[PDB]
Copies of this chain bind each other. A is one copy, B any other.
Amino acid sequence: SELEKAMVALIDVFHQYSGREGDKHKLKKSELKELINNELSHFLEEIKEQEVVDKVMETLDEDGDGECDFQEFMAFVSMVTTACHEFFEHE
């Protein structure tokens, strides 16, 4: 199914991406900054100072674990979905 590739694509991208530095399956704030710059950047910019990341990162951490777990990581992935409104409703 087309959704199977979408789901499978995310895991393959996450584990390969999460295995860049530090323990696998653990996104650090420094690692989070790299992911946003490389992955989410064409639709969102800003982030010019670490303090801007510290506020967003702490807010991102629902449990305040200081890092972004796989479970929350899916939330942020969804937030990018729930954040953007449907723009395909216009001709």
A binding-site residues for B, Cβ under 8 Å: 1-7, 9-13, 15, 39, 42, 70-71, 74, 77-78, 80-82, 86, 88
Majority SS at the chain A contact face: helix
Total identical chains: 2
A81 and chain B: residue at smallest CB distance: B7
Known: A74-B78, A81-B74. A9 touches B3 (CB 8 A): yes
Selected from B1, B70, B88, the residue in CB contact (under 8 A) with A42 is B1
Selected from B3, B9, B74, B82, the residue in CB contact (under 8 A) with A2 is B9
Q: Identify 13 new A-B residue pairs, CB closer than 8 A, beyond the known A7-B80, A11-B88.
A: A1-B42, A2-B9, A3-B9, A3-B10, A4-B42, A6-B10, A7-B81, A12-B88, A15-B86, A15-B88, A74-B78, A74-B82, A78-B78
